[PDB]
């Protein structure tokens, strides 16, 4: 439960900031809304169909 | 905890104290003193749970204000005074003395003691050092700090001390074939004469001890406490003579 969805994020705000720091530093190694996504995809498809 | 604690649970007590689980949630946390924590005994547990003469803290408190008992001649007024092994307990109105000494059952043990035996007490010299202005001195097992001892004495050495002057009556060295009490460990209380000592440089040195039934065991030097010679104890011993049986 490192990146956990708490009950009160306005309370765990600074907690969230330092956890953000942890996630950034730890996955520096690696780096170095779904309806909106589906509408985005189908938007690309319709735009491309009109291009075609 | 952000410091020390004033509190002692029922179950947190040492097992040898033989205190029940049900007449309290708390054990009386013993005050600081000569002996260390687990190998001591508060005087109220001594009196109420062994001598049974008082039944309440108000009672034993009134007794301490009544200024009766002198430990090694000195009265304490502390209830949780840390009384440890090999102690002299003086009872004026009952006219008795008591050597506190370990049990064959691994517990402690009171000993009815006469005034002449109470006049002195025994002590394991645990560290001899040279103090400031080049003064030589010793500290015993019971925390007695004695300046200017006999030079032949070394660490871990048994010493008879007169309590009346607080002075070195005499001493007893650390040789094989000396009568030894065992203070801690599984086999504590089993009085025996030392076979020998397996010594380790910087290591916990083991000790081989044979007692009267020709039974041999091995403990550590910290548990080792020499009493006297063979058939020559400087103290009176309780019944059983520290002998484990079936």
């Amino acid at each position: 439960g490192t990146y956990r969805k708490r009950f009160n994020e306005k309370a765990r705000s600074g907690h969230m900031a330092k956890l953000k720091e942890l996630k950034r530093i730890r996955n520096k190694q690696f780096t170095r809304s779904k309806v909106s996504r589906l509408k985005k995809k189908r938007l690309d498809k319709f735009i491309e169909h009109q291009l075609k | 905890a952000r410091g020390p604690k004033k509190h002692l649970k029922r179950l947190a007590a040492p097992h040898h104290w033989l205190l029940d689980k049900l007449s309290g949630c708390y054990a009386p946390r013993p005050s600081a003193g000569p002996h260390k924590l687990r190998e001591s005994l508060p005087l109220i547990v001594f009196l109420r749970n062994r001598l049974k003469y008082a039944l309440n803290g108000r009672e034993v408190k009134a007794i301490l204000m009544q200024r009766h008992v002198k430990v090694d001649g000195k009265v304490r007024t502390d209830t949780t005074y840390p009384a440890g092994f090999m102690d002299v307990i003086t009872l004026d109105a009952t006219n008795e003395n008591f050597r506190l000494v370990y049990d064959v059952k691994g517990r402690f043990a009171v000993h009815r003691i006469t005034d002449e035996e109470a006049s002195y007490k025994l002590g394991k010299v645990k560290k001899v050092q040279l103090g400031k202005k080049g003064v030589p001195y010793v500290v015993t097992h019971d925390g007695r700090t004695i300046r200017y001892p006999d030079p032949n004495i070394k660490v871990n050495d048994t010493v008879k001390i007169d309590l009346a002057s607080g002075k070195i009556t005499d001493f007893i060295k650390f040789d094989a074939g000396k009568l030894v009490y065992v203070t801690g460990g599984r086999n504590l209380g089993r009085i025996g004469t030392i076979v020998h000592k397996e010594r380790h440089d910087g290591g916990f040195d083991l000790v081989h001890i044979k007692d009267s039934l020709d039974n041999t065991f091995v403990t550590r030097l910290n548990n080792v406490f020499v009493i006297g010679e063979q058939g020559k104890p400087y103290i009176s011993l309780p019944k059983g003579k520290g002998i484990k049986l079936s």
Binding site: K18, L22, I25, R26 | -
Partner: protein, 177 residues
Amino acid sequence: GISRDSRHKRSATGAKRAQFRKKRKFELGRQPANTKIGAKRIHSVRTRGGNKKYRALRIETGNFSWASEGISKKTRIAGVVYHPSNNELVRTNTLTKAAIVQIDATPFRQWFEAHYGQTLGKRAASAKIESSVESQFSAGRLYACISSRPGQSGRCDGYILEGEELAFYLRRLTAKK
């Protein structure tokens, strides 16, 4: 404030450590006394237990030992000549342990003149001293090493530089000029 923990540093496996608990009082770090030269300025602090500790802020004079004579005199400090960690501390004339400085030479030279009936510059087997020490006496400034912690003790107690280290550090000063 400052602490000196380890659970913040990287692991030996090069791993980043999550925080274990809140920072504790007893692992605190205090500010270094960047002691410079000035009128006598000393503060104290109740360290753990209640143990007093004296920081030096500005301190003018100090005490210094002649080891080959086994004596010591309270002389005044000129300025920081060399520091093996920081030529910035050389520049800023900051007074800490293991520093190479110049100090007065007159009270030690007066002591020599008194003890030996012989001047410095310009029992004789005992009175023969090193040539560079004669040079520092004729100059009036003595090379010395701060080996005290005025940041901790409040003490500036050093010793005069003697043959091998004086030769070494004079090579160092000659190469650094």
